[PDB]
Amino acid sequence: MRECISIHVGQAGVQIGNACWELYCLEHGIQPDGQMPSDKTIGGGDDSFNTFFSETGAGKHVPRAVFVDLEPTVIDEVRTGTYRQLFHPEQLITGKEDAANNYARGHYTIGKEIIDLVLDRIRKLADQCTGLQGFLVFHSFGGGTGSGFTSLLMERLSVDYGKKSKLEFSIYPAPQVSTAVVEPYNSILTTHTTLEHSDCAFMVDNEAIYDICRRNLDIERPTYTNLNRLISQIVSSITASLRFDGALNVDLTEFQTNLVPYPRIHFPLATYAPVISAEKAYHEQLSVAEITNACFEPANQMVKCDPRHGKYMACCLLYRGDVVPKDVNAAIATIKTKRSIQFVDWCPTGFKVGINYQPPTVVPGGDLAKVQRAVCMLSNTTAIAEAWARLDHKFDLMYAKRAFVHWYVGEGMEEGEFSEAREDMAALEKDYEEVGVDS
């Protein structure tokens, strides 16, 4: 057994992280106070779920989590909130004033000021691990902390743990909920600087989640709580394989091996189904065929984009609930003839499949209805580059006039770092194209 440490950075990482541990706790049967009747290894154990929870002499199961926001307001809610007993104070790290939606201010100005302390509190968790494998890093692209500090933390982590793996859950900026016109700046900045230091990044476009909440949950104007419960669902699916018995995606290296043949093209598309409103007067349940097909519908992707126009390099099917392989393979047979699923030549057309019999856990009171089976697909398609083309266009429109740039320079960053980041993204867009040129 090997542990994973989760690092939640910024408002979005912290609030998302909170929904994940809320969910995590339900699934493993841990109560708001760390106690877990299921565990008869009182004081410890090398069980699958211990990769995410260490165990306290008194019986407390404690997330291997570390939160960090360059200001106290949001994490203060975790200290005071409903799961206050779950975390030890040393892993809820707050500064005083925040990055002001300014990448430069979060990387350079206030980075330095808090980096060492974060690396310290982090090394405090590695020391408590028999066989640490790496980190799950949650953050927004668009805030100053989520973009700027995260790219700083990522570089210190590679220097201080070259052996270990680093996975990102990144939140991609959407006007419907963004709080800053400069998000495309911070997004390109942090992608360029984190790129070589991340092994697998799961990009969640707030826009995609927003419309799933309106269209399928009937939420008229989704808040961050709606948004975050769904993301915690999807995040749970991608991690289920590290907290439960299984033979698929059992440690972080496998995510890269199964999902990422090319290091830079390490951004796999996630697609989840079914999203059903719990307030919906009886729903006719969906089959393994129906949920699996729904996996190739753009309206269920965590990023709107058209995988028909692009190739595939890898595909993972992650089932939760009442599924057996005869139905999975039978479903793939059917859809395989209907949909446009071209892989790249240097890769075989195929699907790795994982089934957990326990159906998705619902957060009592949330918007999601319980369903007898569910599926998250993790496919690596060049079509996700679409997201980089939109974000790169917004950047080009602003930067060509140096709009707002003085805010970055004013913090010690040189204008040219802007151009070096955008050129990195230019090259990344070329990579995706090269691999996807076929049709």
Binding site: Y108, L248, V324, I332, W346, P348, G350
Partner: protein, 54 residues
């Protein structure tokens, strides 16, 4: 078409299915990075105070 490496638990199963076969910066440079940036913002300010003292 071909179902490979089936693996069964009491929690689920795992397997591959193929339909068709194929065909680091150091702590040093980082400190240079931050320190140099801080000295540019330290200078910019000093210029500001100098202009105000004028």
């Amino acid at each position: 078409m071909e179902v490979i490496e089936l693996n069964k638990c009491t929690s689920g199963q795992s397997f591959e299915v193929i339909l068709k076969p194929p065909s680091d910066p150091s702590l040093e440079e980082i400190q240079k990075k931050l320190e140099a940036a801080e000295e540019r913002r330290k200078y910019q300010e000093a210029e500001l105070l100098k202009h105000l003292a004028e």
